[PDB]
Every structure is written in structure tokens, then in C-alpha cells.
Amino acid sequence: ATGQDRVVALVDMDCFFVQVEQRQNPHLRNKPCAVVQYKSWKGGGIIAVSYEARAFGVTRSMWADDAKKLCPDLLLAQVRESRGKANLTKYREASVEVMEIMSRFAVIERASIDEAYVDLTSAVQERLQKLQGQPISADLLPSTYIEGLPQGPETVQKEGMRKQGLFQWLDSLQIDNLTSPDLQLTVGAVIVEEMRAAIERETGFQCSAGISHNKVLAKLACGLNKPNRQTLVSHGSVPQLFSQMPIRKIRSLGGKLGASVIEILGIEYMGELTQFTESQLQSHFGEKNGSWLYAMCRGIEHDPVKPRQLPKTIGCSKNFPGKTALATREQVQWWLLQLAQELEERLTKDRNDNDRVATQLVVSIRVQGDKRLSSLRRCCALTRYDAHKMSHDAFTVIKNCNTSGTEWSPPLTMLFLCATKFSAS
DNA sequence: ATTATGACGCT
DNA sequence: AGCGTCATA
């Protein structure tokens, strides 16, 4: 297998939280704007940045006071705050709208609130059967980029480059110089064009997509041309694409594994991995990672698009950084309640909409001076969707953690509640 | 003082 | 059951 068996798309809503605020407030449209939460500490922390604002150098995880220095005209939208914490309901609801529309076209895996994987293999077959011996016009692919094209001999403008590359691709399909998987990708891209058109018409939200044979290539493809554009990445484009592609760019290699691959093997780019035998890769990085790397540097990935549109867990948390770390038993109880109260509302909605019930409650807390996200995880049975019950049980489970008092030590930097193990209802 | 959520793999 | 990795709004 050349890993050309499937057609897979990754769709990413461009600066999704910004878009949601821009649809609601027309004033923010087509302007440098960012979404922040909690204005009191340094203007608030930016979590979403429009493309107009990015040009000024405004980035995520930046303090709003700092972003205003780069972009004096930056407009800000504030995350809804409920019970003393961030409330993301508006963005979760908008996300559902998008997911439902995507559902009509093909089978979808929800990757995050803003992005989803699409398995288009069956859909492209139908289209290939439905439309037989029919040439694919350039007009059907108005925002599609073919990676690696144009090649050889109005290039100076970006849109000129796009069309010329598209024409070369199409002419080669037309002529029969392009393989059946290349045709499958193209039809896949046609469908993604329509899916994206349906999303914008019906929600007003724009998005970018990558089309390829697996999830990793599709995701890489998606980021090549943004915003509001889609990029086809063929099996043939992979060698040139990987040759100058930093290892950290590939999904799952952005962390410690990727760094160890670079450090151990002494390589910079993804394509350099082809030198090494599978056994060599497995020896260094383990059987599972080795096998995965051997195939992936050749553009082959087998992870399936899971038929899942609903989150597997439902959770809420609040950090209590630095001085605000919780020191009294009463403080700890109160926030657990606030956390439990938001959770109950979300769980009941979930039950009515999605015909399922969570059976387990997980408590995660973090203590002062700990590098790790979570210092401790602990679980209890979840039998009633009741805030007072859930909050009280959560406390019962973690009360032993306290070193000595009714003071609590070490002070809590984080409280986390997660509903898990859903069952059909 | 990146904040709040996620999905997984390992053991 | 509990911990660590990776990811993005």
C-alpha cells in the first residue's frame, strides 16, 4: 500500500472564537480583534486572534495590555464569565452548528471545538459513480491549492499561482498522467469545497481544510494555506514537502518525542527519517512509535477517522495561580460547588440532547510548586446530576490530600471536575 | 500568572 | 485505577 487507499479531510475553523464574536457583533468584522478572558489581570489573556490582528504580531497566550502595544487599534471581545469562571457555552453551541452541517456530507470525527476530521472515501466513490467520465472544471475548486504546484515553466500574485497550479493538476488528471488516488483526492476536494460553502452559507463561519489520504497529511495540508482556503496534498507531493519540513510540524511530534527524534538521530526534517530502518526506529523510540515513524515519513498513516461527533468527557476547571491559591477549607468547598453547578447544567443538557448519562466523576487538583498540570487524580461514582452531591463527593475524595490545618496546605492552584464513562440513556 | 478543555497511551 | 503526553480555543 502507498497509503493512497483513503480520502481524508481536516477542517479547521479560522480563529473560531473570534468569528463567533464577529458574527454576533458586526462592528468587529474585518478588523484586528482578539478574544480574551478575565480583563483584570493585564487586560486578560488572549485565546483567539483574528488574521488582521496576527499581522501586527498579536499571538495567543499574550496579555491584552501587551497586544495593545503591538496593535493599538486592537478590538477585544470578552469570554462570558459565570460563577467566577470562564463560560464557553457560546463557542460550544456554535461548534455544534458547524458539526451538524459537516455531518450531512460524510462521517466526522470531532478533534476539538474548532476542528474535525472527515472520512470522504465512500462519498468520493458515489460522486465518481454518479458523475461518470465527466471532467472536473477549475470552477469547482475556487479556493483549492495543490501543494507543490505550479512547477517548471501572472505568477507574481498569489491567486495567479493558485490557478496555474490547479490547471497543471487538472490537465494531468484530464490527460490521465495522474493516478486514480489523485482523482479521488480531487473529487474529495470538490466535496470539501461544497461542505465549506454550506458551512459559510448556513452559519457565516469561514474555515480552512486539508485534503489527503490520512489524518496527519490532511492536518499538515490544512495549515499550508490560511485563512479560508483548502489545500490538496497528494502522495506524490510528500517527498519534496517532507524534505524541508521540520519534524515538530507533524502531528504528535511537536513535543518530547519529536525532540528526541531530532536529538537522537541528528536530523532536522521529516524526510530524513526514510534513511533509517524500521527496526532502527523501533529500537530508539519503541515498537509502536518506530512503526509509526517509518510509515509516516513515507506519507503513510493508518489511524482511522473515528465515527464520533460528541465529546467523550465533560469537564470544567479553574486555575488559582500564585497568590490566589486556595488556603481555606471553606474556599475549596465553594469553588467545587461552582464547578459542580456548571457541570450539572452541562450534564443535563447533554442528557436531553444526546440521550446519554455519565457514570463517573473525576477530581483533579494541583498544588503550589508543582510543574505538572495535575498533581493528583481521583474518581468517584456519579449517580445523581446534582451539584450539591457532586461537589460534596468531590471534596470527600480529596480531603485526605490536605497536609494540616481548617487551613488547607499546600494551597491549591487548580480544581478540576470531569464527567466520564457515558452510557446510552 | 498562559486559561480551560480535550483525547490518548502507559502501567 | 492513576499518571504523563500532546494539542488548541
Swiss-Prot record:
Changing G152D: In a breast cancer sample; somatic mutation. GO terms for biological process: cellular response to UV-C; DNA repair; DNA replication; DNA synthesis involved in DNA repair; error-free translesion synthesis; error-prone translesion synthesis; pyrimidine dimer repair; regulation of DNA repair. The enzyme in complex with the DNA substrate binds a third divalent metal cation. The binding of this third divalent cation, which is coordinated by water molecules and two oxygen atoms from DNA and dNTP, is essential for catalyzing the DNA synthesis. Its main location: nucleus. The keyword DNA-binding applies. Mn(2+) 2 binds at D12, D114, E115. Monoubiquitinated by RCHY1/PIRH2. Ubiquitination depends on integrity of the UBZ3-type zinc finger domain and is enhanced by TRAIP. Ubiquitination inhibits the ability of PolH to interact with PCNA and to bypass UV-induced lesions. Keywords: Disease variant, DNA damage, DNA repair, DNA replication, DNA synthesis, DNA-binding, DNA-directed DNA polymerase, Isopeptide bond, Magnesium, Metal-binding, Mutator protein, Nucleotidyltransferase, Nucleus, Schiff base, Transferase, Ubl conjugation, Xeroderma pigmentosum, Zinc, Zinc-finger. A 2'-deoxyribonucleoside 5'-triphosphate binds at R60. Mn(2+) 1 binds at D12, M13, D114. Residues 8-254 form the UmuC domain. Binds 2 Mg(2+). Prefers Mg(2+), but can also use Mn(2+). In vitro, can also utilize other divalent cations such as Ca(2+). GO terms for cellular component: cytosol; nucleoplasm; nucleus; replication fork; site of double-strand break. Mg(2+) 2 binds at D12, D114, E115. It catalyses: DNA(n) + a 2'-deoxyribonucleoside 5'-triphosphate = DNA(n+1) + diphosphate. Its EC number is 2.7.7.7. Its cofactor is Mg(2+); Mn(2+). Belongs to the DNA polymerase type-Y family. It is linked to Xeroderma pigmentosum variant type: An autosomal recessive pigmentary skin disorder characterized by solar hypersensitivity of the skin, high predisposition for developing cancers on areas exposed to sunlight and, in some cases, neurological abnormalities. XPV shows normal nucleotide excision repair, but an exaggerated delay in recovery of replicative DNA synthesis. Most patients with the variant type of xeroderma pigmentosum do not develop clinical symptoms and skin neoplasias until a later age. Clinical manifestations are limited to photo-induced deterioration of the skin and eyes. The catalytic core consists of fingers, palm and thumb subdomains, but the fingers and thumb subdomains are much smaller than in high-fidelity polymerases; residues from five sequence motifs of the Y-family cluster around an active site cleft that can accommodate DNA and nucleotide substrates with relaxed geometric constraints, with consequently higher rates of misincorporation and low processivity. The UBZ3-type zinc finger domain and the PIP-box mediate the interaction with ubiquitinated PCNA and are both necessary for the enzymatic activity in translesion synthesis. Interacts with REV1. Interacts with monoubiquitinated PCNA, but not unmodified PCNA. Interacts with POLI; this interaction targets POLI to the replication machinery. Interacts with PALB2 and BRCA2; the interactions are direct and are required to sustain the recruitment of POLH at blocked replication forks and to stimulate POLH-dependent DNA synthesis on D loop substrates. Interacts (via C-terminus) with TRAIP. Interacts with ubiquitin. Interacts with POLDIP2. This is DNA polymerase eta. The chain holds residues 2 to 432 of 713 of the full protein.
